RNA sequence: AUUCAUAAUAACUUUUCGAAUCGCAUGGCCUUGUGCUGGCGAUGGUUCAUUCAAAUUUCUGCCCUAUCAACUUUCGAUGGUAGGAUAGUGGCCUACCAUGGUUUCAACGGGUAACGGGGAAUAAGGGUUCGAUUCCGGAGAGGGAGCCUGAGAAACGGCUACC
RNA sequence: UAUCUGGUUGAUCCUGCCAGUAGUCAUAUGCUUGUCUCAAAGAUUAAGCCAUGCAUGUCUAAGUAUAAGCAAUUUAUACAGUGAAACUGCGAAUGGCUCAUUAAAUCAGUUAUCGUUUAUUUGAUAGUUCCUUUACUACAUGGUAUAACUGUGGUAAUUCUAGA
């Protein structure tokens, strides 16, 4: 008998199982952003739906209302300091415009392979899933680190990943230790 | 059933204490004492929460039974000694004192105080009677039985005892244009004068209060502590005195605290 | 083994609700009491062994009943029942006359003496002398407080009556 | 010289406990979590007291390495920590051993077989021996 | 708001309480007797407050069923008086008295795969279904019944009796 | 997250259900099961029955220490330290479990005690102890009666108990 631990679902599953339309535009998105499963596309839009129905609630109360400022104000800001809506249109209106790909673009997997540093977005998830990514002095190895814009010019390598340094790697000193074993000392 | 509890569980407490969901399944259960179990703060309760002076409850034994915490001049070594508002706390050790006001959020606020307002306290008074004997006293809020006061001392008004023996130095009378604190309700540790109040013949009178900046709100006479004149308070306010400005404008100190 | 009570006038065992502070039974908890059956007082056949005290020595000598004492393990603890014991006075002393029991730890020899119960000592006619000063003391400050209080309202009254009469 | 970058954050005194209260988080690049008696001899010239006299506990370092967050103590004298330290951080200091009890299990089976016996039991015990004897 | 607090008078009591208790310090004083006086507490203790409460209690709110429309009142049902009992109000019980009380606005009866609520699932809105169960209140310790001690139990890791 | 689709006919438009469809802190079961966090878990049928072990005891300078216990005492030949056992005081009426009863009953929100009890905590509180004193009973302080303890036993047995 203790405090119950708090937990919820964070993805919903779309009512009409096979639409052809809908399986289109999943597998497009998880092409593109190099995605796992559907799951991750159900996630960010469980997101969308959360706050697009914040954003509704909320402009359904009328202008100058506090309680309509300071949610509005809050979602607005913490949208704007994530990069999904922009440094304009700072309305929740075009909160309600947002889309399933203004979170897409702000993933760590997403941002790695855009700044350079990962040539790929497949190459990006698996630099940052074998820790080879550190966001600020701490390494994530989460995809959806989902960057919020102060960090955009600190996604760099870990120091502790042979691409940053600090170590030549498991499998270069096995194969530097095989060319020692057939050369000599 | 079957007699008293003893047992204090988690999210059974007073919401003040601001204590853990987690780390335990119990809360510490107030003792008898002078004031009520859900409007007093334990002293394991402001000493390992508030202060923070303890990291578990057995070194919060450990300072009472070396009977450095002591209240209203009083050693209390009792863990969950209940206490309460218009409560000083004084550690002899690093000379230090506090007063159980509330703040502006309805919680029970660390407020350091001087050695002069260390040695006196108010006291609501409860009740007025004649004791045994035809002798007159006063209850006060915090079941101080006080023989022998002033008789122009009523129901609702307010006592300064001397702390240091069970009398009293000067009282201050339940009138509109005085400053009031009020102790119950959700309008919770608010500051303002008197208005007015209603007769309400029958009982549960009201009162009501606005602040210094024109915030009028009611409140049940049993929640109104009268803690001085119109201004000139008797005790040294808490940081925030009282105004409960809206959420907005406390955000916007938030930023201007940051701001530098 | 079934112990015979005191007053049952029967030659069988019975049960009884047995208490506190009766033969035969020691309670566990605060009011507690237990049905045990116990052996009439009336002497039968069926017991196994009865208990005799010997009110009044005969002429012959037995092996061993009459022939060996057994030491008295305890003196009196008490100053007044140390008193009575030896036979002093009223008011003499006792701690020449402690029961002194002696111990030998085979190399140490060390001597023992009860703690002596309801002596007189100047503490403890200290602490009865200050409860006499606290209710003389308590007596005067209440009777201060009452005068006080009394002259408190006679102005109060002189006061009010003054402004009553002239307005 | 490996940079370990010891500070204490939140430092309060606690002279209430006759001790002062900080946390402890250090830098160790290239190195895992280095060990805590070390810290304690470092924290020991840090305040300026003694090395008996720190206790530390905590330190669990971040996740990437390279950082370890932990509380530590520094007391004023080391009667006055022994005192007021937890007997199980005695042993962990190395300033007492562990004092050799039963198991939970046995000492309550040794009190439920004590409750049976009421006073010391010495007269039953040569009556068990008499009553087998004869 | 009181026949309130309190006081006074006359009394009454298988006469209540009003320290024959313990630790540490032991200062000061002169009729120099181990004399007078004194400190810091602990445990107690009558009563009034306080707190923890408890007990009863005011209004309003509960599922399905009429193939349940009349129910309650012998063995109290509704009220009056008086008494008894209770910690205390009260048909709570007794004695006398009156014939009342509930009901289609669903009494009473039956069923519940009924502990109540805070809550949960689903849901555009309105709703539907669930809530034994991390908190609050209740009830029980195989079924009943009775009781001792205790401030508080009709206690079951207390007792007694029957099954 | 304000959505429908297949099935009556030779074909049509309907009513209408069946069938699909999507969740369930909603249970069971099949197959499969690498990592970290988090954690429901004998409620449903049987509040059916239970082997065994544990779950309630408690001592500070401050009630009682002649353990024929330990260290031995710390003017200390009355004791003084610790201290088993046992008298004494307090707790054991908290908790934990379960939901079988229970349908204005519990319960919920809201009222009352001017209709009551209340250990403990906290504040205050007692010069009168004079039986019918013109008859007080030791206050530098009354008494016994017991445990633990010693010794004699009973019964196969129990946290059973007797005599001294
Ligand atoms: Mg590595
Ligand atoms: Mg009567
Ligand atoms: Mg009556
Ligand atoms: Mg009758
Ligand atoms: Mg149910
Ligand atoms: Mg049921
Ligand atoms: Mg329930
Ligand atoms: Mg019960
Ligand atoms: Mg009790
Ligand atoms: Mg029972
Ligand atoms: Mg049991
Ligand atoms: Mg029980
Ligand atoms: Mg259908
Ligand atoms: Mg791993
Ligand atoms: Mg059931
Ligand atoms: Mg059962
Ligand atoms: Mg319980
Ligand atoms: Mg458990
Ligand atoms: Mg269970
Ligand atoms: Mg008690």
């Given at each position: 008998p203790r405090a119950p631990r708090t937990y919820s679902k964070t993805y919903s599953t779309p009512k009409?199982?096979?639409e052809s339309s809908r399986l289109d535009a999943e597998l497009k998105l998880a092409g593109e952003f190099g995605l796992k499963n559907k799951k991750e596309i159900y996630r960010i839009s469980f997101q969308l739906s959360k706050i697009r129905r914040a954003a509704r609630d909320l402009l359904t109360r009328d202008e100058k209302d506090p309680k309509r400022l300071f949610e509005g104000n809050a979602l607005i800001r913490r949208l704007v300091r994530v990069g999904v809506?922009?440094?304009?249109?700072?309305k929740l209106d075009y909160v309600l415009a947002l889309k399933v790909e203004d979170f897409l673009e702000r993933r760590l997997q997403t941002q790695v392979y855009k700044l350079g540093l990962a040539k790929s977005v497949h190459h990006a998830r698996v630099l940052i899933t074998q820790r080879?990514?550190?966001?600020?002095?701490q390494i994530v190895?989460?995809?959806?680190?989902?960057?919020?814009?102060?960090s955009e010019k600190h996604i760099?390598?870990?120091?502790?990943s042979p691409f940053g340094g600090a170590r030549p790697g498991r499998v270069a000193r096995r194969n530097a230790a095989r060319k020692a074993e057939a050369s000599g000392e | 059933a079957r007699g008293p509890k003893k047992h204090l569980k988690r999210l059974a407490?007073?919401?003040?204490?601001?204590?853990?969901?987690?780390?335990?399944?119990?809360?510490?259960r107030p003792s008898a004492g002078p004031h009520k179990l859900r409007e007093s703060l334990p002293l394991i309760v402001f000493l390992?929460?508030?202060?923070?002076?303890?990291?578990?409850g057995r070194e919060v034994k450990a300072i009472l039974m070396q009977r450095h915490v002591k209240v209203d001049g009083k050693?209390?070594?009792?863990?969950?000694?209940?206490?309460?508002?218009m409560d000083v706390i004084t550690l002899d050790a690093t000379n230090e004192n506090f007063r159980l006001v509330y703040d502006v959020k309805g919680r029970f606020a660390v407020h350091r105080i001087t050695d002069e307002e260390a040695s006196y306290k108010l006291g609501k008074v409860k009740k007025v009677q004649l004791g045994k004997k035809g002798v007159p006293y006063v209850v006060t809020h915090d079941g101080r039985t006080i023989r022998y006061?002033?008789?122009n001392i009523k129901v609702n008004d307010t006592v300064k005892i001397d702390l240091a023996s069970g009398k009293i130095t000067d009282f201050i009378k339940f009138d509109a244009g005085k400053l009031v604190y009020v102790t119950?309700?959700?309008?919770?540790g608010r500051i303002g004068t008197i208005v007015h109040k209603e007769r309400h013949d029958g009982g549960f009178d009201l009162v009501h209060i606005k602040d210094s900046l024109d915030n009028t709100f009611v409140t049940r006479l049993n929640n109104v502590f009268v803690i001085g004149?119109?201004?000139?308070?008797?005790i040294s306010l808490p940081?925030?005195?009282?105004?409960?400005?809206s959420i907005a404008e406390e955000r916007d100190r938030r930023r201007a605290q940051q701001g530098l | 083994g079934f112990p015979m009570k005191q007053?049952?006038?029967?030659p069988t065992r019975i049960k009884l609700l047995l208490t506190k502070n009766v033969s035969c039974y020691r309670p566990r908890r605060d009011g507690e009491r237990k049905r045990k059956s116990v052996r009439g007082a009336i002497v039968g056949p069926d017991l196994a062994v009865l208990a005799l005290v010997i009110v009044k020595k005969g002429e012959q000598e037995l092996e061993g009943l009459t022939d060996t004492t057994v030491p008295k393990r305890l003196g009196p603890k008490r100053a007044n029942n140390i008193r009575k014991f030896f036979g002093?006075?009223?008011?003499?002393?006792?701690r020449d006359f402690v029961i002194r029991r002696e111990v030998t730890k085979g190399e140490k020899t060390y001597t023992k003496a009860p703690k002596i119960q309801r002596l007189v000592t100047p503490q403890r006619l200290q602490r009865k002398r200050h409860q006499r000063a606290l209710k003389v003391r308590n007596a005067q400050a209440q009777r201060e407080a009452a005068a006080e209080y009394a002259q408190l309202l006679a102005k109060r009254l002189s006061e009010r009556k003054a402004e009553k009469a002239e307005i | 010289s490996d940079a370990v970058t010891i500070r204490t954050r939140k430092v309060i005194s606690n002279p209430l406990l006759a001790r002062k209260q900080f946390v402890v988080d250090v830098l160790h690049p290239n190195?895992?979590?280095?060990?805590?008696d070390e810290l304690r001899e470092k924290l020991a010239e840090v305040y300026?007291?003694?090395?008996?006299?720190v206790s530390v506990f905590g330190?669990?370092?971040?996740?990437?390495?390279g950082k370890s967050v932990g509380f530590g103590l520094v007391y004023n004298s080391v009667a006055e920590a022994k005192k007021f330290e937890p007997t199980y951080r005695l042993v962990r200091y190395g300033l007492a051993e562990k004092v050799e009890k039963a198991s939970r299990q046995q000492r309550k089976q040794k009190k439920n077989r004590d409750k049976?016996?009421?006073?010391?039991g010495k007269r039953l015990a040569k009556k068990v021996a008499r009553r087998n004897a004869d």
């Open positions: 009409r199982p096979y809506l922009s440094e304009d249109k700072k080879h990514i550190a966001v600020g002095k190895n989460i995809p959806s680190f989902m960057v919020r814009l102060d760099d390598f870990a120091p502790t | 407490a007073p919401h003040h204490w601001l204590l853990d969901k987690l780390s335990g399944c119990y809360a510490p390992r929460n508030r202060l923070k002076y303890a990291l578990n050693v209390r070594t009792d863990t969950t000694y209940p206490a309460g508002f006061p002033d008789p119950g309700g959700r309008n919770l004149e119109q201004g000139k308070p008797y940081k925030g005195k009282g105004i409960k400005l | 007053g049952v006038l029967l002093l006075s009223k008011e003499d002393d006792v | 190195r895992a979590n280095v060990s805590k300026k007291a003694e090395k008996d006299a330190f669990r370092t971040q996740f990437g390495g049976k016996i009421f006073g010391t």
